[PDB]
Amino acid sequence: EVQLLESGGGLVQPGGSLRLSCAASGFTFSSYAMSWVRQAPGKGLEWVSGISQLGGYTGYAGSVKGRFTISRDNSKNTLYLQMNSLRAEDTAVYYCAKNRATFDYWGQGTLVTVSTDIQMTQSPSSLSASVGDRVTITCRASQSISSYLNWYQQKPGKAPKLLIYAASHLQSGVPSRFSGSGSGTDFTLTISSLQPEDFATYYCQQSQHKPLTFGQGTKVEI
């Protein structure tokens, strides 16, 4: 039912410009804040920008401040990211996502190639296990964040998916072998019995304070 369809990526020279589009369907687009999150090749997820329902409030990561502009056209159910003065450091897959701080749906990602914060730390950074094993992943916040903690799963080549929100709530449709626990500064995601489709990188993310930050990712290999 919910789809976020991205377009507009490509290859540009340093200093160049691109515009990304994210077409939404299956939910009431104008009722939700919308966001952009990027991922440089082989690296973790990084929040880039967000925009309120009617466009009056926007936010940008410090590194793109003044060069990127987020906008939306509610009458076309479309979110945009205008990217000027592109730098090598901007090379990444760009995801749009629904909501401000709990990203319950993600676009498929579009590749752009140019050629005080709350720190989240995950343990382990990677692990190799076998079908049927129990896996636990720890996420620590550098300050107390109560229950404002989400978990995402990202299979190789794919967009992230929300698994757990607000520390312990199972997102609709997620298998019950996934569970979340914890509070304050220490949180855990548990996969009670690892299935073959669970090989993926898992990310925690605090939803309480700007700028939004992700853990570095835990790669679960088989």
Numbering used by the authors: 3 to 117, 134 to 240
The authors write:
The M2 is a proton-selective ion channel, and it plays a pivotal role in the uncoating of the viral core during entry and viral assembly. We selected a 10-mer conserved epitope of the N-terminal region of the M2 ectodomain as SLLTEVETPI (labeled U1) used for screening against the Tomlinson (I + J) scFv phage libraries. Four distinct clones (AU1, GU1, JU1, and UU1) were obtained based on changes in the CDR regions.
The scFv GU1 was crystallized in 4 % MPD, 0.5 M sodium citrate at pH 3.5, 20 % PEG 1500 in the apo form for which the data were collected at a resolution of 1.9 Å resolution. A comparative structural analysis of liganded scFv AU1 with unliganded scFvs AU1 and GU1 and models of scFvs JU1 and UU1 was carried out. All the scFvs superimpose with RMSD ranging from 0.358 Å to 0.498 Å. Interestingly, if all the three scFvs (i.e., GU1, JU1, and UU1) were superimposed over liganded scFv AU1 homodimer, it was observed that scFv AU1 homodimer in the liganded state is stabilized by more molecular interactions compared to the other three scFvs, perhaps translating into functional consequences. All scFvs demonstrated binding in the sub-micromolar affinity range. Interestingly, the other three scFvs, did not show reduction of viral gene transcripts in the medium, although they bind to the M2 protein with comparable affinities. Interestingly, our results showed that scFv AU1 could stop newly formed virus release from the infected cells while interacting with the N-terminal conserved region of M2 in a dimeric state.
